Amino acid sequence: MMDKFRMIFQFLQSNQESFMNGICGIMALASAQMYSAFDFNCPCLPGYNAAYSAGILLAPPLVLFLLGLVMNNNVSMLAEEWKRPPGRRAKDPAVLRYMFCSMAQRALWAPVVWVAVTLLDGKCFLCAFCTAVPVSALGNGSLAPGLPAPELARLLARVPCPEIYDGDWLLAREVAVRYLRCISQALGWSFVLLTTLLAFVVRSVRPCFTQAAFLKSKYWSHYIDIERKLFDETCTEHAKAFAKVCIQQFFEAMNHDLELGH
Amino acid sequence: MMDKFRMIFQFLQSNQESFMNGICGIMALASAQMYSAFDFNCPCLPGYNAAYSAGILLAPPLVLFLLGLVMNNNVSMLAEEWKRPPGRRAKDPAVLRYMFCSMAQRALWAPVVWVAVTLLDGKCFLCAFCTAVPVSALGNGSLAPGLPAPELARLLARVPCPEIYDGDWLLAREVAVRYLRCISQALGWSFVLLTTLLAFVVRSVRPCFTQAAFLKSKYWSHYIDIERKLFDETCTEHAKAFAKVCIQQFFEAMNHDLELGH
Amino acid sequence: MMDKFRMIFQFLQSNQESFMNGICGIMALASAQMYSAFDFNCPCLPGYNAAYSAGILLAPPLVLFLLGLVMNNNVSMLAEEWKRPPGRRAKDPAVLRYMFCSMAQRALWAPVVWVAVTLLDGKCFLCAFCTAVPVSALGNGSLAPGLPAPELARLLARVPCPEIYDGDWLLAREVAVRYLRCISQALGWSFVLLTTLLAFVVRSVRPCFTQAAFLKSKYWSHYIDIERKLFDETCTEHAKAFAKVCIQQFFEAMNHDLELGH
Amino acid sequence: MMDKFRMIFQFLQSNQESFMNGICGIMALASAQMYSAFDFNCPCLPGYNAAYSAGILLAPPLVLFLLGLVMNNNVSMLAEEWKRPPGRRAKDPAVLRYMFCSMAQRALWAPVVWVAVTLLDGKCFLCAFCTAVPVSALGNGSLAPGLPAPELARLLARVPCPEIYDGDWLLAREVAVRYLRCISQALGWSFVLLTTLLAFVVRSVRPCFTQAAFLKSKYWSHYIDIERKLFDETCTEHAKAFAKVCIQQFFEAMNHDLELGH
Amino acid sequence: MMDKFRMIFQFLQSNQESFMNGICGIMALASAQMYSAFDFNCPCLPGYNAAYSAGILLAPPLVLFLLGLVMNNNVSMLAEEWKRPPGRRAKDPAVLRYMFCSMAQRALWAPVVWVAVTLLDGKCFLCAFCTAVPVSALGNGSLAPGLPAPELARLLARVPCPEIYDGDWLLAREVAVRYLRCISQALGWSFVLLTTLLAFVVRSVRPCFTQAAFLKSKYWSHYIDIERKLFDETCTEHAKAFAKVCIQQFFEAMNHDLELGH
Amino acid sequence: MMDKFRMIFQFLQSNQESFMNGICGIMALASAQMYSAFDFNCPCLPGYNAAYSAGILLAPPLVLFLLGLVMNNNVSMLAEEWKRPPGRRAKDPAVLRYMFCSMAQRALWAPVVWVAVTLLDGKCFLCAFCTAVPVSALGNGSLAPGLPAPELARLLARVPCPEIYDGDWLLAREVAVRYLRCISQALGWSFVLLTTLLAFVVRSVRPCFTQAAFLKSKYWSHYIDIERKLFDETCTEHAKAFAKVCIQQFFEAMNHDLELGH
Amino acid sequence: MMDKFRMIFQFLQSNQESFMNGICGIMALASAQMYSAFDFNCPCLPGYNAAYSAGILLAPPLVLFLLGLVMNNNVSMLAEEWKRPPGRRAKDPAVLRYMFCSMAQRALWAPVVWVAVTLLDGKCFLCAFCTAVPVSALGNGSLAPGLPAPELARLLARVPCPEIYDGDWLLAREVAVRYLRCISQALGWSFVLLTTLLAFVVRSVRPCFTQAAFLKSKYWSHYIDIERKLFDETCTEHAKAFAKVCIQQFFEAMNHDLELGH
């Protein structure tokens, strides 16, 4: 099971060449790996499955999203100037709208890797649709020998839980699995395809790439840096002149000498 | 079992990029790992469980909290100036109230990782509510064949202790477990979700972020640095002039020469 | 199974000598390895195979292609100046046609390694043509003992799925496999041969290597570098003169002194 | 068993950021690990246990304490000036009392880790109170079938020694153990809690933190450094002028030439 | 199986001392290792073997050859000036003939290591001549008990495929193998001997080592270096004077000020 | 089997202190190790052995010898000036005879380690003289019960091939082996002794150590270094003045400007 | 078996602090380890043992001795000036006698470690005196039941060869061994004791430590260094003036220009 995460492990061990997305690589690479040690096991009960599996395609994604906004050091400047009234805003809506949108496209670089990499291994999908398999399809001389609706859902639904499987009635194990891990791995490619193709279009066309506001932004965020870095200079400077008055008082103020004079 | 902690192990091995929270990463990453080597095993007795399990969601958290306050080098300055009377305080309540609050939000970065990572593996939860499972639910032709209340609590309660399990009466093992590790992993996500979302709000709104007092603080804590660093200069300086009087006395004072003169 | 990817692992661990193709080595080396942890298992059903196997020679290649264009920092400059009308284009078609073509030959350095390295292990090919093996050829006293067409496709088609194989009727297992992994490894060499030989011809002849336009290009892309790097200078410069007016206001504006004066 | 010590092993391998306590980390981290290779096995005899177990909670702690005082380079200066008569002491009782107390709180950082980490694994506690377990409690249809007092102590007392356990009379093995490793791990937390909370109070209040004597101390210990470092200068200086008189005598004093002159 | 390649692995790990051949060591060392992970398994059918084995002594060699020419950065200069007409060639045939020949003797340093290291392990040779072994030689009381020609080729030919071997008729397994891995390892030495001895003669005598043309060559290839390296200087220089006109326009052209003036 | 080569592995890993012999350590240390992965297995047939074993004490040595001459960068200078006629030789026979002899004593540092380290493990010797063991010596009640000459050579000769050994007739296995690995390890010491003792004599006496010609040599080989290193200076110098005429033509020759002028 | 040598392995891996003896540590540490991979197995025949075992306490020691003299770079200077006649010797007998003796005490630092470390494991001693064990001593109801002298030597002598041991007649195996590995390990300590104690005396007293000749020696050996290092200066200097005359001839002598002039 180490394969899905040990790969980025040496890849992390490989080099130190990246960007903000590589800074996102600090987190989401763990998201490529955090799946590995976090186990998965479904109740194999009659109706809980379709509830439970939807838990592991919506919450842990949404967590990794919101942990992207708070993680970067900008949201205050947008949060601060939004709550204030219009007019008083020292920034145009344009620089707001852009700079707000350039937070999403650095955060989304995670909640898409953790929806691929829990489809390609199918576990998330297996416990979610096993209740409705066409049992007549490849059923070893099938025909549903008088089987009812209840007490068959409890027959099908165990399929992922291996050692507690009921038996050969209208199914083997290795044909009900290994046919739901096929259909799953079809979505996993026909999903990641559509997303990356939609990564094309975005850059390639447009949405708030105006040469005007891009300039004002990068100027501004560059300006906050020099402000913080420079304020410390005056403090340490202005403080240095102030310590000399007091520290000297400790000297010449205990005994004006040492008793250890030989 | 190494997975839950070996992950941060190479992640620790990964790089050296962090902050005070990464300084908290020095500790709490161990808290992500300290769970790994510290075993867990419940009494599997009739009433001790619900006592014992609550031991491992309140004490070891609270320890990691208080080890956060004492660990950082500020509490004296707050502790010193609080015990003194008002008025004599060389600092406003504002700089107090802020600087005191900026100790919590650097300490809490632990006692939340050690409440997630002992819910997602369910062991802490399993030995805490096994005494009340609906045995009729998925009970292999159930009906409670005349079973009493006592001598059934001692029947259910063994469920986590594997090799000492009684038997198939109104239960298998792999259906009483693997249904309490489902419910548990639901809280683990629906908890960590709520917390991180509440990490949003805090930064994003406010609570003592006033531009006034933030300035006075960082100036002040910057000032203590130069004071300590500079005091050593005068000492080593003022001492150097003093050693010369005595060290010379050792010379010219033993024999004023060596007998080894050839 | 680690062999196919652990090789580039220490090879990655080996040194840091490469180029843009070695920059492509950042990705496609993973493509040499990403095969390793991504499992493969075919439905072993009557008609799905020839559908499913074609999934793993066209989609995951095409993904690695498009992830090559978006990955490098040029497509905007081509995308921007293409959408505009002719005439307004500040660049000749020649520099366009070349610079556009020099994106392909840096991207193709992947989708050819992931078509070799899933033929040489034959798994991709095995589940794709097992339905039509000449069963009379090496069939252990063959003759097709009255076998029909249906209920034989479901007999042959299981061949890759080992533990669910039907039996010795007109076949053993280790002669239907180990004869489709021969034919496969013949394409894998007679393919990689043809490609590399076609790598010869390209460099060796020509296609838009004109001394004229190559010059204009590398000059231009060199020019964008100095533009971005130099703009930051004026900002940090022009900003530094501006901070001094405000930062001083924070000083001398809170109390013009400290109450901590002893 | 490597877990309890292999953790600090990579943690030691982790980085080199610490202080005098981290200098104590040089020793006590071994004390976190020295437990690992030093085995434990109790006599499983009738009365020796409660003697023997108390051996491994008082001696090996007390050793690690005294190895803390001697390890640091200060005790002579306190030991030297204590044996002398009062009055002649070149240092106030205050600087004595403080500097003596600042030896304990750097030594205690060990003999508390080696009392936790031999309670949390319970072995030290198991062989110490097995002689008095309530056998009627969870005793598999108990009632003490005429059992005497002697020849039952020799029945209970074997409990830790696994392969030499007598048998099922009024006990199984896995219920007499796994109920004394519960009670133990309760002290281990309710102990380490109380200690760390008492680490709070100490810093937070007071005990000889007077601004007066802290100054005189750190000045003094700073002064001993420059004295030792500077004495070597005069020696190597004063010696250099002295060697020239003799070393020249070796020259011009063997033959005033070489016979190897060609 | 790691031995044949793990050797160069630490040897690669050993040091970084080599030349262009060591640059070829970048590739062919993999060719010493690429054999390791690329499996080998022959059809064990009647006539395909002698076809199939010849596949693995001619194609994968020839690939590693052509990947040597294209890999080095010279063939264009030879390819460019060859297609042109004579007379216009700015270089003598001598510098052509030499410089063309000094491409082979740096490429051949591979396709000879991958013909040794797939003879010394004999697998390539075993599946190629098993069809004609003298069965009477060491045949355990032989005499060919009426065996025909067909249905014996299918008897011999299985010999490498272990678990599918027919049986003891006129052969054991461990005497038909372990006599074809002897004859093979004789060629492997009597081949590598002849080649290295022919490496002697080449250097030691001659073939286009003329002092005249060697000079002109190394001068020329040295000249191309300074040309490319120096062209970038004029560009970045000539460009720097050009950016200042436009970048200033962005300044003073958005608002000529900031609205954030307090 | 890793022991014979894993030793030099960490020894190689040990340090980087050596000379030309240590440069030979680059190769022959592999020769100490190349034995490890190159297997050994003898035909166990009647007459081939004494042929085959002599293959592995003469060819692989002789290869490692000739790979020593070609490996060092001197043979051309000797090869070049030998083919020429006497008189024209710019070097005395003395400097020739010495410098030629100082190639052997740096090459022999291999083909002696690969004759020891395939005697001390005896495998090379076992398959070479098993055909003539005195079977009466330690033969478990011997007497040769009417055994003929043929059909006994095929009885003895199998002795190294373990699982195909015939049986107890006039021999066990572990007394025919373990008496030919004794005699072998006697030569291995009484050989390496004689060689190293002959390493004494050589240095210690003489053979072309004349102070005259040693001087001329090391001067000469020192001179070739400065010649090659210095020639590159004039080229890069003389070329630099030449590029400026052409590179400027590319500028001012495409458009004398850019169309991108805004 | 790795223990005897893996120890110095990490000890070698430990640090790089040593001297000429540590330079001897380069070799003899291998001698501490070379025992590990070099196997040992005695003939277990009637009279060869006492011959064979003496082979492994005299030859491999004596080899490591002579490999110490030749290894260091001094013996020529002693060998050269000894063969010459007295009087012509440019060095006194004293500097000879000392400098010759200071070769032994750096060589002996090996052939004593390889006589300890093949006694403490007893294998060398076991196969050397098993022929004469007092069989009556601890002989399981002994009395020598009519056993003869011959056909008992062949009974005792097998004792080290485990699987070929005859049987229980007048002996078990684990009492004839495990009583000859006791007596052996007694010599191993009572030997290494005597040697190290004799290392005391040597330094502590005397043997050619005269202040006169020690001076002349270290001066002399210091002088040879500067001679060799300085000779290279004049060569490279005197050569540099000489190359300029010829290298210029290559220029201006091929064509006095290039045909590539455009």
Residue numbers in the entry:
A (entry chain G), B (entry chain F), C (entry chain H), D (entry chain E), E (entry chain A), F (entry chain B), ...: 1 to 262
Any passages from the paper?
Calcium homeostasis modulator 1 (CALHM1) is a voltage-dependent channel involved in neuromodulation and gustatory signaling. CALHM1 is the recently identified member of a large-pore channel that permeates ions, including Ca2+, Na+, K+, and Cl−, and small molecules, such as ATP, in a voltage-dependent manner. Furthermore, the ATP efflux through the CALHM1 channel in type II gustatory cells and the subsequent purinergic signaling has been shown to facilitate the perception of sweet, bitter, and umami taste sensations. Our studies here showed that the human and chicken CALHM1s have a conserved structural fold, oligomeric assembly pattern, and a phospholipid-filled hydrophobic pocket for controlling channel functions.
The single-particle cryo-EM on hCALHM1I109W∆ct in the presence of RuR showed oblong density consistent with the size of RuR in the central pore surrounded by the NTHs. The resolution of the cryo-EM map is lower around the NTHs and pore region compared to the TMDs, possibly suggesting a number of subtly different binding modes within this binding pocket since the pore diameter is large. Nevertheless, the cryo-EM density is of sufficient quality for the placement of RuR molecule, although an atomic-resolution pose cannot be determined from these data. The RuR molecule is positioned to plug the pore through associations with the NTHs. To validate this structural observation, we mutated the pore-lining residues proximal to RuR to arginine (Gln10Arg, Gln13Arg, and Gln16Arg) and assessed RuR-mediated channel blockade by patch-clamp electrophysiology. We reasoned that arginine residues that face the pore of the channel, being positively charged and bulkier than glutamine, would disfavor binding of the positively charged RuR and decrease the extent of channel blockade. Indeed, the Gln10Arg, Gln13Arg, and Gln16Arg mutants all decreased the extent of channel blockade to different extents. Thus, the experiments above validated our structural observation that RuR binds and plugs the central pore formed by the NTHs. Our hCALHM1 structure shows that NTHs are positioned approximately orthogonal to the membrane plane and that RuR binds to the pore generated by the NTHs from the eight subunits.
